[PDB]
């Protein structure tokens with residue numbers, strides 16, 4: 001750590017604190033994540049150094065020293081959360097939302113093809129640059145925001161799939177469109193019941209095996225499903241159809257990132273330049 005000079009704090013996640021810092025040996029500006037302290041973890045995190053893609057924030061180095069683990073990432077100038085807040089009055093232009101969703105699906109199709117799951121996607125770990133790119137940051141291993149958590153995780157599935165990332169990305173897609181979080185729960189049950197109130201309480205018909213899930217209770221209230229036309233206006237039919245497939249209850253029915261890339265919603269995708277204030 002003698003080679004790094006902290007500039008300022010940029011985040012505080014579940015695992016640790018993220019700082020903007022300068023590398024004294026190269027002059028590079030980086031995002032440095034400090035985890036306060038697992039040999040299996042050092043090896044798995046070191047494997048993430050090889051996982052390089054244009055839509056993945058580069059993990060430059062993993063430094064294990066003095067009962068701390070430091071992850072050195074490339075630095076990006078803004079997160080999606082700051083951009084969504086900056087764009088709250090006007091909305092993010094639809095061609096930019098579509099570009100960002102397309103790029104994030106490319107990043108997920110890549111990581112998922114290598115059996116790497118993120119498990120905690122949220123606007124704070126989606127990073128953007130001035131050129132129109134957006135990248136996924138800080139993949140997880142096998143106050144906390146629950147807003148983007150897949151229903152199978154809330155219902156106690158410990159052996160979940162890559163479908164958890166598609167669910168989170170669908171929630172973020174809805175939020176870019178409407179400028180409001182889709183399911184802003186403030187407890188595990190509030191989060192689950194907010195999902196049920198919009199998509200209907202799941203049953204064996206739409207999700208086989210749901211009633212045998214560890215935290216499923218037969219006493220859950222039975223709410224009817226709402227129409228997406230009411231949930232994400234003014235998203236067109238291609239966008240609402242894609243979103244509905246990203247939010248299927250059954251992880252096995254939920255669209256994959258690869259299949260989502262071929263969706264007709266992306267027929268006219270372009271790569272616009274965002275209006276960034278840094």
Ligand SMILES: Cc1nc(C)c(-c2ccnc(Nc3ccc(N(C)C)c([N+](=O)[O-])c3)n2)s1
Nearest residue numbers: 010011031074075076077078079082137138
């Ligand atoms: C939760 C996070 N984990 C990682 C690893 C993160 C990461 C990785 C690479 N670049 C960045 N840049 C970043 C993030 C957040 C901000 N806010 C202060 C808006 C900014 N800004 O300049 O403002 C830059 N963050 S952010």
